Ligand binder design. Sequence first.
Ligand SMILES: *CC(=O)/N=C/c1ccc(C)cc1
Length: 225
Amino acid sequence: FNLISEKCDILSILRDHPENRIYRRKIEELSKRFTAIRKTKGDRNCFYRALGYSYLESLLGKSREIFKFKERVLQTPNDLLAAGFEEHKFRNFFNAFYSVVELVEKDGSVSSLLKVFNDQSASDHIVQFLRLLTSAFIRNRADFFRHFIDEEMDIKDFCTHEVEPMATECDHIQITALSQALSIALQVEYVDEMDTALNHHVFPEAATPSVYLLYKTSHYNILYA
Ligand SMILES: *CC(=O)/N=C/c1ccc(C)cc1
């Protein structure tokens, strides 16, 4: 369980910030709204790894939602090809993501899903697939990211340097892009060391979330409502 942990009580993370007034206040508040947490390894891949695991976990036992997600995943090779990725270079990463989706359908257990995401090889193939898909979806919608995010940014250089490579950190653009690319509704809770309100953002704005993440000390952990 070195990449994604077992579930722990929310108040168990007080020990990560001992004798810190502001962290203690916000974790106590968070505990009023959430019951449990899973921790992720802080290796620069934790956003992709957390979102991937938590979203597939939320599908277990839901036969219609699994059918619809499988249908979308089968079309993602077309997104990658439209953005200029070559099939023989994405094949190994697509095949690893499709395999874990069939595992959700066929096997249906938390234990089996958690083993794949703690297997360094399988888990890293999954993360690399999610990074390529994020890149593709941004590149195919460059005017949308320029219009609504940043009219001055260089989209192709940004994807090359800050999306595709393993261990590169995320920002709002990557979160928005992967959310839209797989139709995943997610809520991020923010815990920083300023004397401010505990606050959250939902991606996309309207939505009812599937997934809850805690962003704290540059790190994304998984929350349970
Ligand atoms: C999301 C992820 O893997 N974060 C890792 C991390 C932890 C701490 C710092 C300072 C940078 C990156």
